[PDB]
Design a protein around this ligand. Structure first.
Ligand SMILES: *[C@@H]1O[C@H](CO)[C@@H](O)[C@H](O)[C@H]1NC(C)=O
Ligand SMILES: [Mg+2]
Lengths: 185, 107, 108, 504
C-alpha cells in the first residue's frame, strides 16, 4: 500500500518560538523515525496566509527531511485553521503534486487549538476530509490543553476517536500508534 | 465449515459515530462473502421473511425425495418410502414412482 | 403475556410485561396504550372495553387484566365456538418527549 | 456577546449520514488459514447514526457451499446527542411543527445547552440570515428534553433540516441534518370571483375527525396568559381516548398548581412526572383524555408564565388525535396577535416568501451623518432610491399597505419608472405601529432590486430588514430651528448625491 503523510503546522503568533521549534523538530523526527517504505511527506504552514513548504513531488525528489524543514519560518499571522484544511485536501492530496490514488492518506494537524479569523467553518471542511478519507492526527501544543474549548477544538479537528489521535508534541510516543497501524497494513 | 463476524478491536468501550472499527471475519477458504449492515430500526417495522441458515436447510429438507420417516409395508416400500427403487432379475421390484410430490393427495 | 396462550380458568386473568427500549441500547421512560382483540381465521373482532392507559417505569412495566373485567366483555358467555379464536394486542407508547410514537403488536 | 464560552455553530460538525441500510459489501477470504480458518479484518467507518448496527453475512465457497452467519452487533452512541423526529408527507406552503429531542445519558452531570434551529431559505422559520434563533436550556442527567419548532416548507421535495446544539463549560456538540419529502397541494380555488385579474400578462403563445378551537387569552392580575382549547368529535357515537400534544411559546410554562387542579379533573389524567417536572425547562406537555364527545364543546384553560424575556415568541402548538390514529390528526398553532398563530409570509399564485425579519434597517443610532447615510446609499445593492409622499393606505390583518407617490426618479435601477407614478409598498402587520407613519407626508426611501414584489407591470414593493425609509416634511415644516439638523443633512445628501451622482 501507499503511505501519503501530510503535515500542517500552525504559525500564528500564539505559537511561541519554542513551541514552533518543537514542532519543526518533532516533524523531522516523525519523518526520520518513520523511515520506512512507501511513505510520502508534504508540508504546509498555516496562519492567516498559507505557504506549502514542500510538496510530495518535491519530497520524492528530496528525501532528506532536515533539508526540507530547516528553511521554515513563523508567519505570525491570524489562525485560519479551517481554511488551511481545504488547502490540504484540495492541493496536497492532488495528483498534480504527487498524490497517488488508493493510498493511506494522513493529515498531521499541529496547532494549539485556537482558530481565529477564519471565514470557513468545520462543518464543510471536516466532512470533506472524511468524504475524501484522510485519517487526521492532531498534535496540540504549549497550552493547547490548558483551556477546555481548545482541547475540544482538537477533538473537533481529530477524527474519531480523539483519544487515539489527539496527542501532545513533547510526548515521544505519538508515532508508535501510527508507526504500528501500518506494520500489517 | 464456519463463518464468524465479531469485532477485531475488543479494546473499545463503545463505538462512536464516525469512527473506524476493525471487524474480524472468520471463514471458509476462498469464499466470497456477502455483507449487510441494517439499522435495527427497520426490524421494529418488519422482521418477517428474514434469512437464516436454518431456513435454508428447511428448504433443502423440504425438497427431500423420501416421503416416510421409517420403514414400509414390505421390502419394496422401505425403498420407495426412502426415495429408492429396487429391481432384481427375479421380478421383485419397488412400486412405480409416478409423482414428483409426496403421496398425500390434497395435502 | 406470561404464557403464550390464554388459559380459560386462570383466575389472575392475564398479566403482561411491557419491554420498551431504544435502538442504541438504553431503556425508555414513558406511558402506554394497550388494546386487545380477537381473530377468527380472517375475521377479527376488536375488544373495546379492555383498553388500559398505563405508565412505563425505567424500561419496565407490568399490566394486569383482572378476570372480573375480562368476563364482562364476552358476547356468548361460554361455548365451544370460542375455541379456535386467537388474541392480538396493539400497543401505542408515547415518550415523555411527547414526540416519538411506536405501534406494537403481539398476535396469535 | 454576553458569554464567550460555547462552540461556534460555524464549527459544529453535524450528524450527516443516516442510511436505513448499507454495507452491501462483498469481500474475499484470501488469508492464510489457521485451524482451517482464514480470518478477515475490514477496518471501516461508523455512520453518523446512533443505533445498534446489525450485521448479516453469507459465505459462498464453491467447495463447502453457502453459510449464513450469527448476526453481529455493534453498539454505537455518545454521552449526549440529539435525534430529530419529523413527519414524512408534509405539504409545501403549510406551517407545520417538528420536535427535537436531545438526550443526556451522563449519570450525574446536568447540562446547559444553547441550541439553534439553523436558517434555511427553503423554510419560513424564525431564523433569518443574520438574526439567529438560539434557545438556552438545561438538562437533568439521565434525561432528555423535547423542543418544538414550527416552520413553513417553502419549496418541494427532499428538504434537509439542521439543528446544532452546543454546551457550556463542557466538551461536545452535535448536529442533526435530516431530509424528508415536501409536496404541493394545487387547489388555489378559494372563493374566487369570476374575473379577479389573477391572470398574468405574458403567459400564453384538515381536521376531518376533530373540531378544535384554540385561543390564547390574557390574565387580570413575569407575564402570564390564558390558554383556551375547545374540542369535539364528528361522528355517530362518542370516540375513544384522544391525546393532546401541547408545546410552549418560546420560553413558556404552565401554572404548576392549576395543572395539578386540572389533572384530578374528570375524564383526564397526566402522570406525576410530566406533572411534577421542573420549572427550569418544562416546555412540552402531553395530556391524555379518557374519551371525547361528538355532541358539544368541552373546553379547558390554564395559565402560562414567561421564564425568559425575548421580544419574539414561537407560536405554541396543539396537536390532537385519537389514541389509535396519529395520521388523521388536527394541528393548530396559537399566538395572541397572530390569528390562528401563523407566521407572517408573503404569497402569490403558488409562491411564498418569509416576511419575519427586522422591519427596516435599525434606526436611532448615534451616527446619522451624511458619511454613513451615503455609504448605505453608495452600496451597489441599492437598486432604487425614491422620494415620495404617503398618498393612500390599505390596512389589513395580513399586511399594511402604503401607497407611495413617486414624483422624481433619484436613482432608478433595474426599474422602469415614469414621472408622477403611484406604486405599492408593503409593511407587515407586526411592524405597522413601530414605523410611526402618517399619510400626506413625503418620504425619501430606498431598497434593492431583490426587494420588488411581483413582475411587470403588476408589481409591488416590500420593506425588509435592510430597507431604509425616512419621512420628508414640507418647506413650511423644516424652517424650525429645532428641525435644522435633519433638513440640513437632507439638503446636502440630495445635492452631493445629485451633482456627483453615484461615484460608480
Ligand atoms: C382559504 O381562505 C382563508 C381565508 O378565508 C385563508 O385563511 C386560507 O389560507 C385559504 N386557503 C388557501 C388554500 O388558499
Ligand atoms: Mg494564533
Amino acid at each position: 500500500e501507499d503511505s501519503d503523510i501530510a503535515f500542517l503546522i500552525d504559525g500564528s503568533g500564539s505559537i511561541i518560538p519554542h513551541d514552533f521549534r518543537r514542532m519543526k523538530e518533532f516533524v523531522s523526527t516523525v519523518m526520520e523515525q518513520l523511515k520506512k517504505s512507501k511513505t510520502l511527506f508534504s508540508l504546509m504552514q498555516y496562519s492567516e496566509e498559507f505557504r506549502i513548504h514542500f510538496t510530495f513531488k518535491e519530497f520524492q525528489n528530496n528525501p532528506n527531511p532536515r533539508s526540507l524543514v530547516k528553511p521554515i519560518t513563523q508567519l505570525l499571522g491570524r489562525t485560519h485553521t479551517a481554511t488551511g484544511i481545504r488547502k490540504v485536501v484540495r492541493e496536497l492530496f492532488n495528483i498534480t503534486n504527487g498524490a497517488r490514488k488508493n493510498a493511506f492518506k494522513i493529515l498531521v494537524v499541529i496547532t494549539d487549538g485556537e482558530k481565529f479569523g477564519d471565514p470557513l467553518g468545520y462543518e464543510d471542511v471536516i466532512p470533506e476530509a472524511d468524504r475524501e478519507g484522510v485519517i487526521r492526527y492532531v498534535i496540540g501544543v504549549g497550552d493547547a490543553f490548558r483551556s477546555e474549548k481548545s482541547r475540544q477544538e482538537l477533538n473537533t479537528i481529530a477524527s474519531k476517536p480523539p483519544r487515539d489521535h489527539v496527542f501532545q508534541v513533547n510526548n515521544f510516543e505519538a508515532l508508535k500508534t501510527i508507526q504500528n497501524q501500518l506494520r500489517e497494513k | 465449515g464456519s463463518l464468524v463476524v465479531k469485532s477485531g478491536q475488543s479494546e473499545d468501550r463503545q463505538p462512536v459515530p464516525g469512527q473506524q472499527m476493525t471487524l474480524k471475519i472468520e471463514g471458509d477458504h476462498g469464499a466470497r462473502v456477502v455483507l449487510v449492515a441494517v439499522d435495527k430500526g427497520v426490524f421494529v417495522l418488519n422482521k418477517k421473511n428474514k434469512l437464516t441458515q436454518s431456513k435454508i436447510w428447511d428448504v433443502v429438507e423440504k425438497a427431500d425425495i423420501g416421503c416416510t420417516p421409517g420403514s414400509g409395508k414390505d421390502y419394496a416400500g422401505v425403498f420407495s418410502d426412502a426415495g429408492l427403487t429396487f429391481t432384481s432379475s427375479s421380478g421383485q421390484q419397488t412400486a412405480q414412482r409416478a409423482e414428483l410430490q409426496c403421496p398425500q393427495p390434497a395435502a | 403475556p406470561t404464557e403464550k396462550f390464554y388459559y380459560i380458568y386462570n383466575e389472575k386473568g392475564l398479566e403482561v410485561t411491557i419491554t420498551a427500549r431504544f435502538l442504541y441500547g438504553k431503556k425508555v421512560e414513558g406511558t402506554a396504550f394497550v388494546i386487545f382483540g380477537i381473530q377468527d381465521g380472517e375475521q377479527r373482532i376488536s375488544l373495546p372495553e379492555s383498553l388500559k392507559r398505563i405508565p412505563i417505569e425505567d424500561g419496565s412495566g407490568e399490566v394486569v387484566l383482572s378476570r372480573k373485567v375480562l368476563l364482562d366483555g364476552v358476547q356468548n358467555p361460554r361455548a365451544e365456538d370460542l375455541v379456535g379464536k386467537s388474541l392480538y394486542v396493539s400497543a401505542t407508547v408515547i415518550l415523555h418527549s411527547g414526540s416519538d410514537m411506536v405501534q406494537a403488536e403481539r398476535s396469535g | 456577546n454576553l458569554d464567550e464560552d460555547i462552540i461556534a455553530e460555524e464549527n459544529i460538525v453535524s450528524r450527516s449520514e443516516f442510511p436505513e441500510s448499507w454495507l452491501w459489501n462483498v469481500e474475499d477470504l484470501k488469508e492464510p488459514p489457521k485451524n482451517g480458518i482464514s480470518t478477515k479484518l475490514m477496518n471501516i467507518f461508523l455512520k453518523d447514526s446512533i443505533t445498534t448496527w446489525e450485521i448479516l453475512a453469507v459465505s459462498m465457497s464453491d467447495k463447502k457451499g453457502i453459510c449464513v452467519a450469527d448476526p453481529f452487533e455493534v453498539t454505537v452512541m455518545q454521552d449526549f446527542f440529539i435525534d430529530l423526529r419529523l413527519p414524512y408527507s408534509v405539504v409545501r406552503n403549510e406551517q407545520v411543527e417538528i420536535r427535537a429531542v436531545l438526550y443526556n445519558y451522563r449519570q450525574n452531570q446536568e447540562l446547559k445547552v444553547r441550541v439553534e434551529l439553523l436558517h434555511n431559505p427553503a423554510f419560513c422559520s424564525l431564523a433569518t440570515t443574520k438574526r439567529r434563533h438560539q434557545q438556552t436550556v438545561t438538562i437533568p442527567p439521565k434525561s432528555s428534553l423535547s423542543v418544538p419548532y414550527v416552520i413553513v416548507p417553502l419549496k418541494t421535495g427532499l428538504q434537509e433540516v439542521e439543528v446544532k446544539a452546543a454546551v457550556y463549560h463542557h466538551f461536545i456538540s452535535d448536529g442533526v441534518r435530516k431530509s424528508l419529502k415536501v409536496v404541493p397541494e394545487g387547489i388555489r380555488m378559494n372563493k374566487t370571483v369570476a374575473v379577479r385579474t389573477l391572470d398574468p400578462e405574458r403567459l400564453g403563445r384538515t381536521c376531518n375527525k376533530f373540531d378544535l378551537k384554540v385561543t390564547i387569552k390574557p390574565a387580570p392580575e413575569k407575564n402570564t396568559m390564558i390558554l383556551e382549547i375547545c374540542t369535539r368529535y364528528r361522528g355517530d357515537q362518542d370516540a375513544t381516548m384522544s391525546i393532546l400534544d401541547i408545546s410552549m411559546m418560546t420560553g413558556f410554562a404552565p401554572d404548576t398548581d392549576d395543572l395539578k387542579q386540572l389533572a384530578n379533573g374528570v375524564d383526564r389524567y397526566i402522570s406525576k412526572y410530566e406533572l411534577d417536572k421542573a420549572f427550569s425547562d418544562r416546555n412540552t406537555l402531553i395530556i391524555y383524555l379518557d374519551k371525547v364527545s361528538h355532541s358539544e364543546d368541552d373546553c379547558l384553560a390554564f395559565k402560562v408564565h414567561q421564564y425568559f424575556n425575548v421580544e419574539l415568541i414561537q407560536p405554541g402548538a396543539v396537536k390532537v388525535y385519537a389514541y389509535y390514529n396519529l395520521e388523521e390528526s388536527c394541528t393548530r398553532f396559537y399566538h395572541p396577535e397572530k390569528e390562528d398563530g401563523k407566521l407572517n409570509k408573503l404569497c402569490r399564485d403558488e409562491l411564498c416568501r418569509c416576511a419575519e425579519e427586522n422591519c427596516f434597517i435599525q434606526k436611532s443610532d448615534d451616527k446619522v451623518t451624511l458619511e454613513e447615510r451615503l455609504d448605505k446609499a453608495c452600496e451597489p445593492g441599492v437598486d432604487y432610491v425614491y422620494k415620495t409622499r404617503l398618498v393612500k393606505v390599505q390596512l389589513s390583518n395580513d399586511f399594511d399597505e402604503y401607497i407611495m407617490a413617486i414624483e422624481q426618479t433619484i436613482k432608478s435601477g433595474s426599474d422602469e419608472v415614469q414621472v408622477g407614478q403611484q406604486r405599492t409598498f408593503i409593511s407587515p402587520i407586526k411592524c405597522r405601529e413601530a414605523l410611526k407613519l402618517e399619510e400626506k407626508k413625503h418620504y425619501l426611501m430606498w431598497g434593492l432590486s431583490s426587494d420588488f414584489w411581483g413582475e411587470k407591470p403588476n408589481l409591488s414593493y416590500i420593506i425588509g430588514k435592510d430597507t431604509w425609509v425616512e419621512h420628508w416634511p414640507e418647506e413650511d415644516e423644516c424652517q424650525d430651528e429645532e428641525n435644522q439638523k435633519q433638513c440640513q443633512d437632507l439638503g446636502a445628501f440630495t445635492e452631493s448625491m445629485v451633482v456627483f451622482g453615484c461615484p460608480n
